[PDB]
Amino acid sequence: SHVAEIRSALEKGSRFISTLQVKLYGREGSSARTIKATLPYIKQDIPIVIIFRALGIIPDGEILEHICYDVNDWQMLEMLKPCVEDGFVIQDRETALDFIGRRGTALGIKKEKRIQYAKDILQKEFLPHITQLEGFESRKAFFLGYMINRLLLCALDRKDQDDRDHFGKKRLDLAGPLLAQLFKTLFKKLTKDIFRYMQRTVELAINAKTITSGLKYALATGNWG
Amino acid sequence: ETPEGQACGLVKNLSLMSCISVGTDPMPIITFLSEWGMEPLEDYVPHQSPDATRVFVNGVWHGVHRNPARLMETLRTLRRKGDINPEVSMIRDIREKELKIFTDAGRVYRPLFIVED
Amino acid sequence: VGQQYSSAPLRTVKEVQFGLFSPEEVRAISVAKIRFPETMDETQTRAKIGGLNDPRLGSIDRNLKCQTCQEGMNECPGHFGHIDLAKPVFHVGFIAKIKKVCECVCMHCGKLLLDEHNELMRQALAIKDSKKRFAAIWTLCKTKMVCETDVPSEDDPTQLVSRGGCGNTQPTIRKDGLKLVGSWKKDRATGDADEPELRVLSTEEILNIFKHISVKDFTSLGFNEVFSRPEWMILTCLPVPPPPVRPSISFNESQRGEDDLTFKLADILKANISLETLEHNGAPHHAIEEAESLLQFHVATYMDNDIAGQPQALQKSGRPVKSIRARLKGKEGRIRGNLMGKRVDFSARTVISGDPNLELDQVGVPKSIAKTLTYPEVVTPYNIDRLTQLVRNGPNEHPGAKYVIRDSGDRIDLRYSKRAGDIQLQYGWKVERHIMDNDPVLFNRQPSLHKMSMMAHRVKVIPYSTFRLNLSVTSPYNADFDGDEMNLHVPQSEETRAELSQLCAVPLQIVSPQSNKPCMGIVQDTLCGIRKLTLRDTFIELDQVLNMLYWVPDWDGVIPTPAIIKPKPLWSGKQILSVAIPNGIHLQRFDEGTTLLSPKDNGMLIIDGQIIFGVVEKKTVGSSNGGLIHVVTREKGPQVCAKLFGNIQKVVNFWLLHNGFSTGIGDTIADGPTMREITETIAEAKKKVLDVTKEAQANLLTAKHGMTLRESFEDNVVRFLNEARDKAGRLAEVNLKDLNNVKQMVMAGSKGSFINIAQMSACVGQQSVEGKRIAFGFVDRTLPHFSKDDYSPESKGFVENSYLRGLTPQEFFFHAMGGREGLIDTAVKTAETGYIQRRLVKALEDIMVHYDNTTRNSLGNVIQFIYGEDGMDAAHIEKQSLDTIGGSDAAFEKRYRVDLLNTDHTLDPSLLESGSEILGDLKLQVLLDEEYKQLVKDRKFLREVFVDGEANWPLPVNIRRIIQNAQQTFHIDHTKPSDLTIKDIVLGVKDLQENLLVLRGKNEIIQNAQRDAVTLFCCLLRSRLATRRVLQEYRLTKQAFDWVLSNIEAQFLRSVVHPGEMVGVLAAQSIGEPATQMTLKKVTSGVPRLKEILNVAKNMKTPSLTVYLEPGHAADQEQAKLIRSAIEHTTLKSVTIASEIYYDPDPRSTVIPEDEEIIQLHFSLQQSPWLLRLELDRAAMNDKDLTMGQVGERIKQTFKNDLFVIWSEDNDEKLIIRCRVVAEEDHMLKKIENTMLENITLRGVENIERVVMMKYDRKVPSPTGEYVKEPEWVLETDGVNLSEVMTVPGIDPTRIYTNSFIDIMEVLGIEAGRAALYKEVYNVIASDGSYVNYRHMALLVDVMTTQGGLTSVTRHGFNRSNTGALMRCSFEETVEILFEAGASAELDDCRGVSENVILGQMAPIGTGAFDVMIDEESL
Amino acid sequence: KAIPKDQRATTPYMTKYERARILGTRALQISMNAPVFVDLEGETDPLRIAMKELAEKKIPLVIRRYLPDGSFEDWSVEELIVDL
Amino acid sequence: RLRNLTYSSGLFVDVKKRTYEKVFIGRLPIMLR
Amino acid sequence: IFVYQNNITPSAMKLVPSIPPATIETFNEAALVVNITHHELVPKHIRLSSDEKRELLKRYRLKESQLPRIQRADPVALYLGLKRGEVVKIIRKSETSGRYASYRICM
Ligand SMILES: [Mn+2]
Ligand SMILES: [Mn+2]
Ligand SMILES: [Zn+2]
Ligand SMILES: [Zn+2]
């Protein structure tokens, strides 16, 4: 019935538009309407509770506090009732991290590795525009809460669904960013081609033209994506 | 000024005074924000402060701030000096408990006369 | 062609029968056997080998020898070879089909796995579309994998019935390029039957199974007993195409030459031979299999180059390839490349400019373009000098020629020719002259959606570039002169000339079929000018009369004697215009307040070609229905009318040039005061809006039933602001003086409507996007310049100002918003309409009216048993008044009752000569009684048809006019008694009717059909030539009368549709063209709807019912409500305030106060402790006319006993249903709570969501006869359920209508379906005021309905809609289309335009819909 | 399949398409100097002569009207009423 | 423009070559003015 | 004609075509609560005798397939008890001629 999309991407580094959707399953009045988020690389929609646990926010009360900044808002908390249930099976960060690990991994893989895979996804794929380093799990939990929030605040006929065509939430990509997309994607082949001058060197071998041709090519046509 | 038919409304033109934001580092602002009483999100408890205006910056929830208008003033005044980059965009949604700051390039903006009391 | 003779009759392909070559035939027709996979050099002795390129097949080496068929490389039609395949092989094309048939038949007995015994199969079998049946059968039979032995009969399942006694399991057959692989199983996972057995179903297996399929079985598939048997899909025997298909480029002598098919065949033959040289030598199995799949591959690749690879090893080590599919990739795409109109020859394109000095049917061709386009004219004693003069003039002097083409077909190129000025033209040579003045050329403007936009004009070579058009030929073409290019096309042959100038010639197009009116009028200047010239105040001094006079070329030189001779000889403006008009032209029309003294110089009377009164404007002189062009066209001929445009234009234009017409900003300014009234008018609405605002912010606005507050507040505001703009707009239109140049155009008819004045002068009015005021794009405010939640007009997008006043920035931006909406979906309407029109045509393309007056499609199916139900051609129909239908019964008697036996109601002895001796003539009064009872049936009949009461219906032969012509042609005086007998009239007319003949068959059925086709015209006729009428009003003498009869008969015949009429195309482009003008209460209308309708979309956007209350109760606002409620789907959800699940454990005492009284009350004259308690809302509770008891015992009858129900009664201040399950309880309840709020139906028909009442004014006959409006309540519903709603007590189930013509069909049958479908298509075309003569839509709506169902137009087929395999070769794969045509025995009727082009023939359309032959009779 | 001179159900009147095509076919003859049947009281132009031949009922052609079932009526241009 | 050239510039990076276990590098079409 | 209230068992449905040539037709009560042929848009359908039928297809020279068609299950056909191959003359009020008569052959 609803979906709460972010399209988070790093401003610099290498632009990874890794979409997180926070989906409210069931339409108004379908028995037990659950919320699930859709993590990148994780081939199944994870109950949002389980993510919070995998993010170290174990106890219901705590999780709900991250979502529902209002103890009287019994309507919203009552919407989540089945979420809390939907993630009942999982009660500690590792089981949670494992739950995710398993929906990102083949059945052969060992628990530690599995947990470790889910630990790296949450650290780098899940909401990467917040932080990609370590200690920032509360930072995501909170943001993810806020997502679930807004999603429900929309589901509760309390919010108008976002205007797709509002211009403030558009960006115009220009000479600068465009020539930087290619130049990133071309310097990355220059960083790759120079790498085939080390693995391949056992004992000045730089293609100027990869970039000259690449920029020059794109601009001579209108070939970007 | 839009071309008719197929491109109609899809190909647009900048009004004479639109420029497009060039893109600025949010480091100094996020730095100023916690210098200016922004509560870190790590150290944030809502059942404790539900009257908390949440500061976002280029989309990132950076934390919280009770008494935002006093943040908002400064933020505005800094930008109106030069000290925060002019192109930097700060919107407070009073009835949403949100103060979203924007520093990324691509934001189409235009100049206006400031009317202040 | 090929100057030799052949005794064989010269014919034209009438049908193409498509089929598959049986292996039998492939040999039978073949000339060779073809064994050797090489050619030439027989031990070096050059020529050919009895293996390829010769054995009997077509010759090379310039040799005539060719099986004694002689002739040589140009005259011989290459004869066909033969090649036996060692093994059966899948023909690539049918691998698909083969597999598919194999899924339908048993793979052992060849027995259709599903019989007439299975019920889902008789519906599959009954389908007549050989293709759709095969699909329906297949989707049914591919489930089967067991060829059933005993099938449950038509009786007891106890009782089995035998069938094909072969019990074996079928494989599920999958494909692998060229091998079909079959895998069996003795059921899915049952004990001792697991694991499929994959075995490759070989060609040898399938072919033999195909042979075992009965003539009955495979015929119930697409297959043809005679033309295409399944077995034949499997090649045993391969046709060898001869050297004209596969050439040999022998470069003079002593060099190799054989085409890329020859090599491709050479490799088949190789594999074939090495497959034989492994059976004949004996071998292993996966060796012959390998040798088979090599062959099968080479046969495959030979025809289709799109399999497991490309064998490109044919004389080249670099590797290219050509198959016969990939030969049609240069021959299905070089025929299609020439089927799409690319090599545009003898045509020319340039800017058009208007030119008031060309005749209506001219086209000014620039000299330079004239010098480019030729006409091949045959040298002829009649033309020897002129042609000779041209040939001398040459390629560069205008009346010159480019080429002189002599007997021998040589082309002397007069441009570069040493004999350019030295040619003796001999009879029978073609000179290719330039087009010169008066050549019929076909002038067309794309996009050409309209027979009228390809018309033929007389050339008139002119100076500068650009084609020049007469202005009046302008809208037929939808052309203006702001840059439009037009194509001119020179008909090249003499008959092709004749056809143009005889059918498409512009004069012949004035009265157009599309709306049974003229389609070319007087326009722009000439219109504006004519009004001015026509005013009473317009007078012409002698000095200027003479010019105007002399300007009209058709002037007879008599200077009209001036209408003022007194102080100054002074002609009326009318008088001289009246010389453009020819004699014998009369016209009567009356406006609102016209009299025979027409104060306002209103209306129109022209008598013998002198406009006696009326301002001449659009009404008269435009393209309008009754107008002077319609009249002059019918009355005096098309050409004489066409010449009229010329005269009128020339005169008026000359007049206008010396009068002058302009328009300034002054014309767009309002009277100082009017502006205050306007400003007041607006500011008077901003209160209204403001009051409703305050009202609604208070919460005092009551939502209109089934409409939200916010929904209905806007609705009011928008109407206020429109009532404003409009009362504002009128306020300026009334002001503007009769001098006002703007209004001066508006009066005359030329560009300019009210909304225009309205927006320029008064208010611009409310902008709107998606039919709402401007939406809050920013949060709760439309611009960052308003405050949040500002719902004022100014904010939400009312442009207050005129355009004259200028728009505020907001107004400017909101206007820009509305504007962008306009252009955006002006681009949508253009794009969708563009494609609808192309579908509508393709749909009706082939419908033609054959010689029997029947109207049939390409197949021959009767679509209409007489074209448009009356056999009339729509261009010969006029709106006419059926008088029998109208007025009090009283009046009916006054006009039509002639009772001789009554000194009062008799014809007065003054009207009639034998007027007195008529008084009391029993015998007569028995005739005149016949007449009248007949007129009475008539009036009755008519009121049955036009239930509406509508008097005025497009009918052929304008009877009013003919009479008006009689009265003038005979100078009948309304003073002396007529010399008619009653018997003359009464019998004369009775006798006339027997003469109006659409149909001629002598049998009864046709005579009955004929009686019907003429019914309506006859009532008109009876009501017009009624005895009193004929004498009282008309005063016809025996002479004029006898004339009127023979005229009515004359025109009636002239009005009958000609066999030949591509009436379908006509009908499609009559529906399309106007839709290409739809550029725009809440129901989808216009093109979305048209694309909805034609699409037969079951999922409509705006499904509505419209139900009418039973006759006796129409006014009962309360019964309208009582039905509304008992219809509108009313769920528990809509009546419950809140639900709550309490733990309330004691079923006596209760933890809820407000319920203690209710459990007490349910103890006067199992259960869970968990209670589901619903609090209901009276508002909507009594609004939907509902009882607690009713809501209650509903839930109690929804949940059987599985729920303990109890409810507060209807007095209690709080309405409550308390419910228990009757421990996992709290969860079963939240389920049940939902099963209540959503599912349970308290009241109404499901799917009927909103139900609005509305007062509809209805035309109904009062007791006294005349048509009285009788208001009726009419429920209109969001949601359709016509079946269940039809049946509701108290509605008029007779009249209940839905726009979902689909549900109508499904409930009321196809005939009603069609009726409704016609009412929908017509609503679309009526919603933009436009008219399209009924027959066009009928024919569309008939074509959609011919086959029992609603067959969509907007393509249903991926191939066809009604297209022969030859016709416009669709997909890059025509091969595929042809393959299927083989397999299904597609029978091409060659009534196509393309098939026949492919065949080098003209279509049996219109001018080609009959044959001409040389008469041996003519003395 | 042919239908006898009596029992012709088809219009006794020439159809606009027929005229279009006679005149066409007839002019195409007149244009290649095939002999004319009427007096050329001035005319040089083929079609105009063809029309004059039709006018004076002197076109020597038979029109074969096919019915949708395949049967056909023959009419002689002479027989056919030209009233359009 | 006349010479059908590209108004580019030499993109010179600055490299640190270190054994572990100026320098012309491409052309950037310069945007006028 | 078997009239019934809610519905029938598709087993008892497979009991219908069972006593030939005698036809059993089945009307759900609800389908009969209103006579569709009394509806406005529903014109006079007149089952033609095979003798009138012969006359039709002859007078007009039409293979059966060339007649306009009506579905076996078309509510007017069912109401008339139309047997496939039976043609109906549909006499409809026309706005062009007074009555026009078109025929549909049951499919
Ligand atoms: Mn225009
Ligand atoms: Mn134009
Ligand atoms: Zn030959
Ligand atoms: Zn079998």
Q: Which of B87, A75, D20 is nearest to C1138 (CA)?
A: A75
8 Å CB contact between C600 and C593: yes
Q: Which ligand has an atom closest to residue C107 CA?
A: 4
Contact partners, residue F15, CB within 8 Å, separation at least 6: C155
A29 reaches C (C-beta below 8 A): yes
In eight-state DSSP terms, residue C1239 is: I
Reply yes or no: is the peptide bond before residue F21 cis, omega within 30 of 0: yes
Question: Smallest CA–CA separation between C833 and chain B, in Å?
Answer: 14
* Pairwise CA distance, residues C133 & C115, whole Å: 14
User: What range does the domain containing D64 cover?
Assistant: 1-84
Q: Which residues of D touch F62 (CB under 8 A)?
A: 69
List the Cα angle C841/C846/C851 in 5-degree steps: 135
Q: Which residues of C touch D19 (CB under 8 A)?
A: 502
| Beta pairing class for F44-47 and F87-93 | antiparallel
Q: How many CA atoms lie within 13 A of E31 on its CB side?
A: 7
Q: Which residues of A touch B54 (CB under 8 A)?
A: 146
Judge: F102–C865 Cβ closer than 8 Å, yes or no. Answer: yes
Judge: C1237–A31 Cβ closer than 8 Å, yes or no. Answer: no
* Pairwise CA distance, residues C675 & C763, whole Å: 10
Q: Which of C1059, C847, C1006 is nearest to D63 (CA)?
A: C1059
B15 reaches C (C-beta below 8 A): no
Contact partners, residue C615, CB within 8 Å, separation at least 6: C531, C534, C535, C601, C602, C747
Judge: D60–C1418 Cβ closer than 8 Å, yes or no. Answer: yes
Give all strands (DSSP E) within C1264-1346, no chain letters: 1267-1269, 1272-1278, 1297-1298
Experimental technique of record: X-ray
Contact partners, residue B115, CB within 8 Å, separation at least 6: none
Q: Which residues of C touch D44 (CB under 8 A)?
A: 382-383, 386
Domain containing residue A145: CATH number: 3.90.1110.10
* Pairwise CA distance, residues D84 & C505, whole Å: 14
Contact partners, residue A104, CB within 8 Å, separation at least 6: A39, A41, A42, A43, A114, A117, A118, A121
Q: Which ligand has an atom closest to residue C475 CA?
A: 1
Q: Which residues of C touch B115 (CB under 8 A)?
A: none
Q: Which ligand has an atom closest to residue C149 CA?
A: 4
8 Å CB contact between C875 and C884: no
8 Å CB contact between C773 and C796: yes
Q: How many CB atoms lie within 10 A of CB C283?
A: 15
Domain containing residue D67: CATH number: 3.90.940.10
Reply yes or no: is the peptide bond before residue C88 cis, omega within 30 of 0: no
Domain containing residue B67: CATH number: 3.90.1070.20
What phi, psi does C968 have (nearest 5°)? Answer: -110, -35
Q: Which of C119, C1005, C1309 sits opposite F42 (nearest CB)?
A: C1309
Q: Which of C1015, C1297, C1335 sits opposite F98 (nearest CB)?
A: C1015
Enumerate long-range contacts of B96-99, CB under 8 Å, 24 or more apart.
B97/B51, B97/B52, B97/B53, B97/B54, B98/B53, B98/B54, B98/B56, B99/B53, B99/B54, B99/B55, B99/B56, B99/B65, B99/B68, B99/B71, B99/B72
Structure tokens at C1151: 């933890």
User: What range does the domain containing B39 cover?
Assistant: 23-104
Q: Which chains touch C (3 or more CB pairs under 8 A)?
A: A, B, D, F
Report the length, in residues, of chain C: 1419
Q: Do the domains spanning C510-662 and C1130-1244 agree at the CATH topology level?
A: no
Question: Smallest CA–CA separation between C446 and chain B, in Å?
Answer: 18
Contact partners, residue C286, CB within 8 Å, separation at least 6: none
Right CATH number for C373-435 from 1.20.200.10, 3.30.1490.180, 3.60.21.10, 3.90.1150.10? 3.30.1490.180
Compare all CA atoms of chain E with the CA of A180 and give the residue at the minimum distance. Answer: E28
Q: Is C76 annotated as a binding residue?
A: yes
Q: End-to-end CA distance of chain A: give it in Å, rounded.
A: 32
Named by the residue before each, gaps in chain F exceeding 2.5 A from C to N are: none
Contact partners, residue C1150, CB within 8 Å, separation at least 6: C1144, C1156, C1159
Got the DSSP string for C328-372?
Answer: HTTTTSSSSTTTTT-S--SEEEEEEEE-TTS-TTEEEEEHHHHTT
* Pairwise CA distance, residues C611 & C632, whole Å: 13
Q: Residue type for A34, please?
A: T
3-class state of residue A36 by DSSP: strand
Judge: B9–C830 Cβ closer than 8 Å, yes or no. Answer: no
Cα–Cα separations (whole angstroms), residue C868 to C1072, C1333, F102: 18, 9, 12
Q: Which residues of F touch C1003 (CB under 8 A)?
A: 59
Q: End-to-end CA distance of chain C: give it in Å, rounded.
A: 33
Judge: F41–C1306 Cβ closer than 8 Å, yes or no. Answer: no
List the Cα angle C335/C341/C342 in 5-degree steps: 85
Neighbours of ion ligand 2 (CB under 5 A): C 480, 482, 484
Q: Which of C626, C840, C667 is nearest to C760 (CA)?
A: C667
In CATH, the architecture of C663-808 is: Orthogonal Bundle (1.10)
Burial class of residue C390 (count of CB atoms within 10 Å of its CB; 0-12, 13-18, 19+): buried
Distance of CA C920 to the CA centre of its chain: 58
Q: Is C91 annotated as a binding residue?
A: no
Centre of ligand 3 from the C-alpha of residue C56, in Å: 8
Residues A166-176 as b/e (b if ≥16 CB within 10 A, e otherwise) read eeeeeebeeee
Q: Which of C383, C370, C499 is nearest to C440 (CA)?
A: C499
Written out in words, the top-level CATH class of the domain with range F35-107 is alpha beta
Q: Which helix (H) or strand (E) holds C997?
A: none
Centre of ligand 1 from the C-alpha of residue C536, in Å: 32
8 Å CB contact between F11 and F60: no
8 Å CB contact between A142 and B61: yes
Percent helix, strand and coil across chain F, each rounded to 5? 30, 25, 45
Q: Which helix (H) or strand (E) holds C1202?
A: none
Centre of ligand 1 from the C-alpha of residue C751, in Å: 10
Structure tokens at C1332: 């399209």
* Pairwise CA distance, residues C197 & C205, whole Å: 16
* Pairwise CA distance, residues C861 & C1389, whole Å: 12
Chain F interface test: which of C132, C516, C869, C1331 (most F C-beta within 10 Å): C869
Centre of ligand 4 from the C-alpha of residue C197, in Å: 18
Q: Name the CA dihedral angle for C1374, C1376, C1377, C1383, rounded to a multiple of 10 degrees.
A: 140
Q: Which residues pair with C611 in a beta bridge?
A: C606
Q: Is C899 annotated as a binding residue?
A: no
Cα–Cα separations (whole angstroms), residue A202 to A194, A196, A207, C14, E15: 14, 11, 20, 81, 20
8 Å CB contact between C1277 and C1249: yes
In CATH, the architecture of C510-662 is: Orthogonal Bundle (1.10)
Q: Which residues of C touch D16 (CB under 8 A)?
A: 502-503, 1058, 1060
Centre of ligand 2 from the C-alpha of residue C768, in Å: 27
Q: Residue type for A67, please?
A: I
In eight-state DSSP terms, residue C983 is: I
Written out in words, the top-level CATH class of the domain with range C346-372+436-509 is mainly beta
